[PDB]
Structures are given as C-alpha cells and as structure tokens.
Design a protein around this ligand. Structure first.
Ligand code: CHL
Ligand code: CHL
Ligand code: CHL
Ligand code: CHL
Ligand code: CHL
Ligand code: CLA
Ligand SMILES: CCCCCCCCCCCCCCCCCC(=O)OC[C@H](CO[C@@H]1O[C@H](CO)[C@H](O)[C@H](O)[C@H]1O)OC(=O)CCCCCCCCCCCCCCCCC
Ligand SMILES: CC(/C=C/C=C(C)/C=C/[C@@]12O[C@]1(C)C[C@@H](O)CC2(C)C)=C\C=C\C=C(C)\C=C\C=C(C)\C=C\[C@@]12O[C@]1(C)C[C@@H](O)CC2(C)C
Ligand SMILES: CC1=C[C@H](O)CC(C)(C)[C@H]1/C=C/C(C)=C/C=C/C(C)=C/C=C/C=C(C)/C=C/C=C(C)/C=C/C1=C(C)C[C@H](O)CC1(C)C
Ligand SMILES: CC1=C[C@H](O)CC(C)(C)[C@H]1/C=C/C(C)=C/C=C/C(C)=C/C=C/C=C(C)/C=C/C=C(C)/C=C/C1=C(C)C[C@H](O)CC1(C)C
Ligand SMILES: CC1=C[C@H](O)CC(C)(C)[C@H]1/C=C/C(C)=C\C=C\C(C)=C\C=C\C=C(C)\C=C\C=C(C)\C=C\C1=C(C)C[C@H](O)CC1(C)C
Lengths: 222, 34, 217, 221
C-alpha cells in the first residue's frame, strides 16, 4: 500500500503514466511525485530525502509549538498575552518581565535576548554537528536519518517490519505538519491573527470568513 | 474556567492505571481478531 | 536554422561555448543553459515539458489579460472589472460575475462553486493530460495531436518541426510579457493596456523612469 | 595541500564530513554541499563559474556601495544621496548624475543613454567573456589571466592556487556583505555605514533584535 510497485501515488488513478522511474518505491513517503525531475540524480535524491525528513520533524514540533501556548491561555489554564500568538511570541523575552513559561515567572524568566541567542548557536550547533556526522556519544548511530536506541529510547522502532510502516507514518504526519506550518505562516501574513483565531472565524461564518474574504487585501492600488 | 480542567485531570491517573493492567490483555484481543 | 549543430544561439556570434547536452533535436534550442540545470537528461526532459506547459498557459494568459481591457476601453463591451489584477473581485459584487457584462451569461454568484468546479474539472483534465482519457491516449506528454490537432496543421513532419519552434518562441515571449504584467501591475496600479497607451501618449515622461522607480527606492 | 587536499579546512571543521564529489581539487572546497546541488560534475562546473562571478561582482559591489557613503563624511563629497540604494535618482537630479558632485564630471542626465550604453558595453564584454574575443581568445573561462592579469601577480602555479582561495574567501565574504546591506536597507532605510555608526554609538540600543525585531509581526516601523 505504501511500498513496492503497487503503492499509493500522488495523482491517484491518473498517476500510473506519470511516476519517475527512479521513484521505485523503496523509501518512506514515495508517492512517485517528482514532476520537476529534481531527485533524478541518485545522490541529490538522497540529500533531499534527508532534508525532507528534517524539515518535517522540525515542522511536526513547530505545529504543537505554535498552537500549545495560545491553546493553554484559551483553555483557561496559564496565561501568555502576546506569547499566545506564535508569530508574536518572539518578543516575550524582549518584553522586559522575564519570558517565564506557562505564565510562571519562577521559571526561565528570560529577559536577555542575546543570552538565548548565543547559547542557542552553541547548544544546537553541536547537536547539529553530530547529526551532520555520526558521533560516539550516540549509542545507536547506524543511518544518520534514523538513529536507533540512542534516540529510539522507547525502542518502538526495534521491530523491523513496524519501522517501515512507522517510517511512512513519520513522513506523512510530517508532510501534513509541513503543509500546515506553511499555512500558519501565510495565514498570519494575510489575516494577521492567531491560527486558532482564524479557525474561529471560519467556524463563525464559513461562507463569509475564508481566504477569499481578504483576497483584495494586497491589491496593487495606485 | 479551570473547574472542568481539574475534574478532567482526574482521568489521567485513571486512564493510565487501567492501561497498566489491561493493555497487554487488550493486545491479545485485537491480535486474535486481526 | 533552428535545429542541428548550426542552430541559431541565444548569445548570437558571441555564444561560443555551448552546453554539450544542449544539442539540437529539440524546438527552441538556443544553447542557453549557463546555470547547468538540465545536465541530467531525465531532468532536461522534465524541464522541457514544464517550459511548454508554462508557455501554453502564458499565451492563454497574455491574450486573456488584454482582451477584456481592450474591449472595455475600445467601447466593444462593458465589463465589471476589465483589468486582470481585479477581475477576480467581480464575484464580490451585487450582480456577481457576468460574462461580457451580460447578466444572462454565466451569471456566477458563489466563489466557492467557482473554486469547487475548477478543482474537479482541472483535476480530471490534468489527470487526462498525464494518463490519457476521453480525448486520447498519451504518446507525447506535450504533443498529443490527434483529437488536439483536428485541423491537421502539423500533419507534415517538416511543418511540425518548424511549428514547434514557433510555439516555444511565441510562448517564451508570452512568459516574458506575462511576467511584465505581474510587475507593471504592482509598480503601476493601472492595467497593462493602459500602460501602453500612456507610453504612446508621452514616452519621455510616461515610462518606468521619470515615474515610480525613485518611489521604489 | 593546505586548501587543496583531503585534509583541507571545512565548513563544520571537526565534525565536517566531505561529500564524495567534493575532493578539494577546486578552491573554496570546505565540503559544504549538504543540499546536494552539485552532485553532477557538469552542473558543479557551471555552479563554480557562477560562484566566482557572483563573488567578483559582489566584491566590486561592496566597495562601490560604501565609497559614496564613506567619502561623504570622512572626506569631501557632495553626492546627492550617498546611500547605495538611493543612487538611481542621481540621474534624476536637477543637473543629472555628476561624478563626485563635479558639474563637469560625466554630468549625465539621460537614463536612456546610460542604460543603452551599458547594454552595448556590457553586452560585448560578457559576449567576449564567453566566446573568447580579442582580449584573450583561448584562455580558461573562469580564470582567463593573460591580458586580464597585467601585473602578473599569480604567475606561479602554487601561489596562483592559494590566491584563488583568497579570491573566493574575500568574494564569499563580499557576497554575504551585500546581502546584509540589502536586508538592513529594507529593515532600516539607512546606508550600511550609518547602520554601523548606530552599532558603534550603541551596540545594545540598535541590535535589530530590539530596534525592529519585535517590529516584524502585529505592528511595524
Ligand atoms: C492561477 C493564477 C492566479 C493569479 C496569479 C491570481 C492573482 C490574483 N487574484 Mg485570483 N489569481 C489567480 C487565480 C485565481 N483567482 C481566483 C479568484 C480570485 C478572487 C475571487 C479574487 C482574486 C484576486 C486576485 C488578485 C489579488 C489581489 C491583487 O490585486 O493582487 C496583486 C498581485 C499582483 C499584481 C501579482 C499577482 C501574480 C503574482 C506573480 C503571483 C505569483 C504567481 C502565481 C502564484 C502562480 C501560481 C498559481 C497557482 C498556484 C494556482 C491577484 C492579482 C482578487 C482580486 O482580483 O481582487 C481585486 C480577488 O478578489 N482571485 C480563481 C478562482 C477561484 C483563480 C483560479 O485559478
Ligand atoms: C545590479 C543591482 C541593482 C540593484 C540591487 C538595484 C537596486 C535599486 N535600484 Mg538600480 N539597482 C541595481 C542596478 C541598477 N540600477 C540602475 C539604475 C537605477 C535608477 C535610475 C534607479 C534605480 C533604483 C533602484 C531601486 C529600486 C527601483 C528600481 O527598480 O529602479 C530601477 C532599477 C534598475 C533598472 C536596476 C533600488 C535601491 C531607483 C532608486 O532607488 O533611485 C534612487 C532609481 O530611480 N536604479 C542601473 C543602471 C541602468 C543599474 C545597473 O546597471
Ligand atoms: C566547530 C563548529 C562549527 C560550526 C557549528 C559551524 C557552523 C557553520 N559554519 Mg563553519 N562551523 C564550525 C566550524 C568551522 N567552520 C569553518 C569554516 C567555515 C566556512 C568557510 C563557512 C562556514 C559556514 C558555516 C555555516 C554553514 C552551515 C549551516 O547550516 O548554515 C546555516 C545556518 C544554520 C542552519 C543555523 C554554519 C552556521 C559557512 C557560512 O555560512 O559562512 C557564513 C561558510 O561559508 N564555516 C571552520 C574552518 C576550518 C571551522 C572550524 O575550524
Ligand atoms: C545629457 C547631458 C550631458 C552633458 C551636458 C554632459 C557633459 C559632459 N560630460 Mg557627459 N554629459 C552628458 C551626458 C552623459 N555623459 C555620459 C558619460 C560621460 C563620461 C564617461 C564623461 C563625460 C564627461 C562629460 C564632460 C566632458 C565631455 C566628454 O568628455 O564627453 C562634460 C561637461 C567627461 C567628464 O567627466 O569630464 C570631466 C567624461 O569623462 N560624460 C553619459 C553616459 C554615457 C551621458 C548620458 O546622458
Ligand atoms: C526557526 C523558525 C522561526 C520562525 C518561523 C520565526 C518567526 C518569527 N519570529 Mg523568530 N522565528 C523563528 C526562530 C527564532 N526567532 C528568534 C527570535 C525572535 C525574536 C527576538 C523575534 C522573533 C520574531 C519573529 C516573528 C517576526 C519575523 C522575524 O523573524 O522577523 C525578523 C527577524 C529575523 C529575520 C530573525 C529573527 C531570528 C530567527 C532566525 C527568526 C527568523 C516571526 C513570525 C519577532 C516577533 O514576532 O516578536 C514579537 C521578534 O521580535 N523571533 C530566535 C532566537 C534566536 C529563533 C531561533 O531559532
Ligand atoms: C514568517 C512569519 C511572519 C508572520 C506570520 C508575519 C506577520 C505579519 N507581519 Mg511580518 N515579517 C516577517 C515575518 C512574518 N510576518 C519577517 C521575517 C520580516 C523581516 C523581513 C518581516 C517584516 C515585516 C514588516 C516590515 C512588517 C511586517 C508586518 C506584518 C503584519 C502585517 C501583515 C503583512 O506584513 O503583510 C503581508 C503581520 C501580522 C507589517 C506590520 O508589522 O504590520 C503593521 C510590517 O510593517 N512584517
Ligand atoms: C510550574 C508551572 C507553573 C504554571 C503556572 C500557571 C499559572 C496559571 C494561572 C491561572 C490558574 O492558576 O488557574 C487556571 C489553571 C489551573 O490549572 C489548570 O486548570 C485545570 C486545573 O485547575 C486543569 O487541570 C488544567 O490542566 C490546569 O493546567 O492554570 C494553571 O494553574 C496551570 C497549571 C499550573 C500548575 C503549576 C504546578 C506547580
Ligand atoms: C486542489 C485541492 C484539493 C485536492 C483534493 C484531493 C486531491 C483529494 C484528496 C483525496 O486523495 C485523498 C486524500 C484520498 C483519495 O482516496 C480520495 C481523494 C479525494 C482524491 C484544494 C484546493 C483548494 C484551493 C483553495 C481553497 C484556495 C483558496 C484561495 C484563496 C482563498 C485565495 C485568496 C487570495 O489569493 C487571492 C485570491 C488574492 C490574494 O492577494 C489574497 C489571497 C487571500 C491570498
Ligand atoms: C514533491 C515535489 C516534486 C516536484 O518535482 C517539485 C516540487 C513540486 C517542488 C516537490 C514539492 C516540494 C514541497 C511540497 C516542498 C514543501 C516544503 C515545506 C512547506 C516545508 C515546511 C516547513 C516548515 C517548517 C520546517 C516549520 C518550522 C517551525 C519551527 C522550526 C518552529 C516554529 C515556532 C514554534 C514551534 C512556536 C513559537 O511560538 C514560534 C516559532 C519559534 C516560530
Ligand atoms: C533558459 C535558462 C538557462 C539557465 O538554466 C538559467 C536560467 C535563467 C535559469 C534559464 C531561464 C529561465 C527563465 C527565463 C524562466 C522564466 C520563466 C517565466 C517568466 C515564466 C512565466 C510564466 C507565466 C505564466 C505561465 C502565466 C500564466 C497566466 C495566467 C494563468 C493568467 C490567468 C488570468 C487571466 C488570463 C485574466 C484574469 O483577469 C486573471 C487570471 C485568472 C489570473
Ligand atoms: C553555496 C550553497 C551551499 C549549500 O548547498 C546551500 C545553498 C543555499 C544551496 C548555497 C548557499 C548560498 C548562500 C548560503 C548564500 C548566498 C549569498 C549571497 C547574498 C550571494 C550574493 C550575491 C550578490 C551580488 C553578486 C551583488 C552584486 C552587486 C553589484 C555587482 C552592484 C552593486 C551596486 C554598487 C556597487 C553601488 C550602487 O549604488 C548600487 C549597486 C549598483 C546595486
């Protein structure tokens, strides 16, 4: 269903005549969709395949990260102010009063923007350097794209057959997150409100409140 | 407010406990009928 | 002249070195791949299909963005919104969208239905273009012919060769001009036909210079 | 073997792992192609040419973008707008574009002529650069030398190779520098030097991370 020559494709019944030969169905999330022939080069395909997985996991984290703060404040638990809006929660630390956390100053209470910035470069840079090159600390390095035990703490990937199916579930939930993350972005640059708020507008007047409501927003008026 | 929250938080220890004592036998059920 | 090793080149006499993969045998080959993006033959084939599809859409778009504007300012017909970068807003009006300004033509009132119908119809059409269907089976993904050449203007292979060049050449000009339509609209809120009239009215004063430009900073 | 070798410096340094196609045979090979856009040798050859040309133009761009703004204060200069971005209006000035403010220097007030001439001038230059015109007919494409090396600095292979690495490193630094000028000119409408002057005056009252950072969403300058 997701592997081999009879896997699900991107153009459904109309995809049989448009599947790149290189996309033989050997890797997770292969719906045979390379219209631009970008992954025609074996090496380039591998490098991209890695990027796709990394962009996906970042996004999958991004989805909850962009909705958790505003959700809690709305859920009637904790408080955040501008920190609720994922696209405005980038001054919370710069906002004098410590960035705090879950609305608790007893926590990070970060105010030094230069602090988090530098520490970030140092901490992530390392974790990225290992990711870039397999390293001893990692107990299970094997393939860089899928380190095992060291990162597979619960060992859910220990079963080989499940790993395949599970890897497909990883990229597909990842691609959905990437698609929604691109949505949260555009939705913000246009509506200028919270993704949850946007949902509230559609739930209020679905026929009136939609993307076409702000279609004339960027008219190139003279 | 949080009135519903606090009450719903009582489910988490209960749901976690039921699983701790039923998950394994449950897995036998959907595996048998798979 | 347009095929083989003696084909004309994009840089003219100064072309000199040309990509080795970029030989003749294909329409519109002027030996311009300085970025080296089509070195892989598989990618080159895909890019060739993308170019002709982007080109055919551009030709339709170039003609489609000018005709309602021409008719409106020539007195031929009265549209709700002649300018292309505003014709979409017609659906958000009292009378909806009326073709050629006639209330008894199309008379659309719901942008959703327009969007839904396009998605279904375009989805099937594009699927037919990539896997065959009612119009015909797929032989050349970009030059089907048969039901798509009822007039038989390309029955003779020699005319088919020169005609493909005419399409890519006319197509490419459409892509450049349609790219202009996008920019001219942003820099000048006036429609592209209005811009042409202004340049004819006073080319020295009405142009991208002596106007805007400095505003773009 | 310092720059050109298997033990060359790399973009990640210690953890850095070099791709198979990247072998250090060419200058600037810090082994940074994680995206994989140069796996094709023919594409990689073309990308190298683009890199150096984008590098060389940026180096000229960095100096050309800073000269009018600098001379304006540190020296004697009366440019209409010293900022590199606001340099087009110089032709739209009252007396046209006057070099160094001198009414006789160039004194061009025709956008048509200055643009048309450039198309004629740069048209031949770039054409000659590709087909090998009189100023070098059969030289190397990316590295012609010969007539385009009057001083003959790199006349020794070993030295030339090292100088090539320097050309890229200065050039790559210049390319990122031009980016800075643009992004900052957009975020803050000031010449790069004026921005620097703000950072010099107060390196903690200007850091975009405050000056405009919380001014990219919700509300802006
Ligand atoms: C397929 C290409 C396409 C393009 C380029 C546009 C462009 C535009 N539409 Mg539009 N539309 C397009 C398709 C469609 N529209 C609609 C329905 C509407 C409505 C109901 C409205 C618009 C409006 C607008 C304009 C929004 C405001 C404005 O003036 O922007 C300024 C922008 C520019 C000057 C440049 C825009 C082009 C730029 C190069 C875009 C980037 C390239 C494309 C994304 C190419 C890819 C397209 C693919 C993904 C479909 C804008 C120029 C609004 C309008 O006209 O109100 C005045 C409006 O209300 N469209 C439908 C049917 C559902 C479409 C179907 O294909
Ligand atoms: C090569 C890179 C390059 C970049 C990044 C810019 C960037 C800019 N130029 Mg140009 N320019 C560049 C090359 C050139 N400009 C001009 C001639 C002008 C003029 C006459 C003007 C600009 C202006 C502008 C601004 C945008 C307005 C515009 O579209 O004007 C046209 C831009 C181009 C034709 C390019 C902006 C700061 C405007 C400005 O800010 O003036 C103060 C303006 O009025 N440029 C020429 C000679 C024909 C160029 C190269 O040969
Ligand atoms: C020891 C840790 C170390 C780390 C974490 C980095 C990290 C980086 N180096 Mg780097 N370097 C490191 C050591 C060294 N570098 C270099 C020489 C270079 C060069 C020549 C270049 C880099 C560049 C880069 C950047 C490109 C990678 C990236 O994802 O960019 C995107 C950033 C993020 C995703 C965040 C990046 C932030 C490149 C760069 O961007 O320079 C401006 C570049 O051109 N490094 C040397 C000399 C041998 C190093 C050590 O000796
Ligand atoms: C449009 C009116 C216009 C006027 C009145 C002048 C006047 C002058 N230009 Mg000139 N220019 C003008 C347009 C233009 N110039 C130039 C490019 C130059 C150059 C490169 C030079 C002059 C120079 C000069 C001065 C000496 C004449 C010469 O050598 O040639 C002179 C006062 C010379 C100068 O700087 O003298 C001090 C000089 O070297 N102009 C261009 C672009 C091709 C122009 C476009 O319109
Ligand atoms: C990795 C993805 C990422 C994304 C999608 C965003 C997105 C955003 N950040 Mg953000 N950030 C991200 C990472 C990070 N930010 C910051 C630090 C900040 C600050 C201090 C601020 C933002 C702000 C913003 C918003 C304004 C856009 C912007 O950056 O303006 C221009 C800024 C940049 C181009 C660089 C900002 C740093 C980072 C690389 C973001 C890009 C915006 C929606 C602003 C906001 O909305 O706050 C109210 C703001 O004030 N970010 C750090 C710490 C170094 C990040 C580290 O990864
Ligand atoms: C990537 C996420 C993101 C999101 C969701 C937003 C969202 C928003 N931005 Mg913004 N911006 C961003 C990134 C983002 N920005 C970045 C990376 C930059 C640096 C170039 C800017 C620079 C910027 C400026 C200069 C301005 C905005 C403005 C705005 C607001 C008006 C919408 C708009 O700009 O028209 C699309 C809006 C809420 C405007 C604003 O603040 O509202 C007044 C405005 O002035 N943004
Ligand atoms: C450490 C974390 C500190 C988080 C401080 C949150 C302050 C919230 C203020 C609003 C409030 O208290 O009532 C509203 C809620 C109260 O608590 C919330 O509501 C219900 C329980 O009353 C539900 O159980 C929610 O899950 C719960 O988070 O805000 C919170 O206090 C968040 C939980 C804080 C836990 C602190 C543990 C120490
Ligand atoms: C194509 C598409 C959907 C395709 C659906 C497919 C393939 C179906 C999925 C399935 O495969 C599964 C999963 C399972 C299969 O077994 C069955 C099917 C059913 C086949 C959505 C398009 C949906 C497209 C939509 C709705 C787009 C709306 C656009 C708007 C509102 C634009 C507004 C503006 O752009 C203007 C006009 C002007 C700008 O200036 C301002 C803004 C505001 C940006
Ligand atoms: C297949 C194909 C084929 C052919 O041939 C060609 C083509 C077509 C090209 C292809 C396609 C492709 C694609 C689709 C792509 C896409 C991408 C994306 C969108 C991504 C995202 C992506 C996205 C992402 C990552 C995201 C990210 C995010 C992050 C990190 C974070 C964020 C955040 C949080 C949490 C919270 C706070 O408060 C804020 C912040 C901090 C901000
Ligand atoms: C050769 C070479 C070589 C090396 O490689 C380098 C390089 C440079 C890379 C290359 C090049 C490239 C290029 C040039 C590209 C371009 C492109 C384009 C511009 C396209 C367009 C494209 C364009 C297009 C399609 C267009 C289309 C259009 C359309 C649809 C329209 C529509 C419409 C109409 C009618 C009207 C209304 O009212 C509106 C609408 C509805 C909207
Ligand atoms: C290699 C690689 C690796 C891996 O693979 C990833 C990836 C991504 C793919 C890649 C990357 C890349 C990067 C990172 C970056 C880039 C940057 C830049 C910015 C360049 C520039 C580039 C830039 C440039 C040339 C520029 C140029 C300019 C010029 C000449 C001119 C200027 C000027 C002057 C003097 C003055 C006036 O007043 C103005 C103007 C006229 C304006």
């Amino acid at each position: 269903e997701f592997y081999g020559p009879d896997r699900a494709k991107w153009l459904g019944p109309f995809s049989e005549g448009s599947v790149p030969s290189y996309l033989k169905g050997e890797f997770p999330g292969d719906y045979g969709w390379d219209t631009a022939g970008l992954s025609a080069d074996p090496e380039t395909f591998a490098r991209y395949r890695e990027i796709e997985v990394i962009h996906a996991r970042w996004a999958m984290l991004g989805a909850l990260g962009c909705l958790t703060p505003e959700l809690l404040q709305n859920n009637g638990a904790a408080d955040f102010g501008e920190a609720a809006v994922w696209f405005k929660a980038g001054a919370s630390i710069f906002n004098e009063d410590g960035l705090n956390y879950l609305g608790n100053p007893s926590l990070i209470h970060a105010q030094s923007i230069v602090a988090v910035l530098l520490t970030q470069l140092v901490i992530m840079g390392a974790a990225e350097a290992y990711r870039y090159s397999g390293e001893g600390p990692v107990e299970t390095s094997g393939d860089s794209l899928y380190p095992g035990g060291f990162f597979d703490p619960l060992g859910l990937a220990d079963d080989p057959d499940t790993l395949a199916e599970l890897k497909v579930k990883e990229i597909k939930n990842g691609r959905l997150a990437m698609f929604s993350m691109f949505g949260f972005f555009v939705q913000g640059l246009v509506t200028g409100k919270s993704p949850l708020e946007n949902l509230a507008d559609h739930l209020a007047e679905p026929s009136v409140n939609n993307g076409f409501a702000s279609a004339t927003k960027f008219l190139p008026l003279p | 407010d949080n009135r519903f929250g606090t009450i719903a938080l009582l489910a988490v220890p209960v749901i976690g406990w039921v699983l701790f004592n039923i998950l394994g036998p449950l897995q036998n059920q959907l595996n048998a009928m798979s | 002249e347009f095929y083989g090793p003696d084909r004309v080149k994009f840089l003219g006499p100064f072309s000199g070195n040309t990509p080795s993969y970029l030989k003749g045998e294909y329409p519109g080959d002027y030996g311009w791949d300085t970025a080296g993006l089509s070195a892989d033959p598989e990618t080159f084939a895909r890019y060739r299909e993308l170019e002709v599809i982007h080109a055919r859409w551009a030709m339709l778009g170039a003609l489609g963005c000018v005709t309602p504007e021409l008719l409106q300012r020539n007195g031929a017909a009265n549209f709700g919104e002649a300018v292309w970068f505003k014709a979409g807003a017609q659906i958000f009006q009292e009378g909806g969208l009326d073709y050629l300004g006639n209330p008894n033509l199309v008379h659309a009132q719901s942008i959703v239905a327009i969007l839904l119908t396009q998605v279904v119809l375009m989805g099937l059409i594009e699927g037919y273009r990539v896997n065959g269907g009612p119009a015909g089976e797929v032989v050349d993904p970009i030059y089907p012919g048969e039901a798509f050449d009822p007039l038989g203007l390309a029955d003779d292979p020699d005319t088919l060769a020169e005609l493909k060049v005419k399409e890519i050449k006319n197509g490419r000009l459409a892509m450049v001009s349609m790219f202009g339509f996008f920019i001219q609209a942003i820099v000048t809120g006036k429609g592209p036909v209005q811009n042409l009239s202004d340049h004819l009215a006073s080319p020295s004063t009405d142009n991208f210079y002596s106007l805007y430009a400095k505003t773009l900073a």
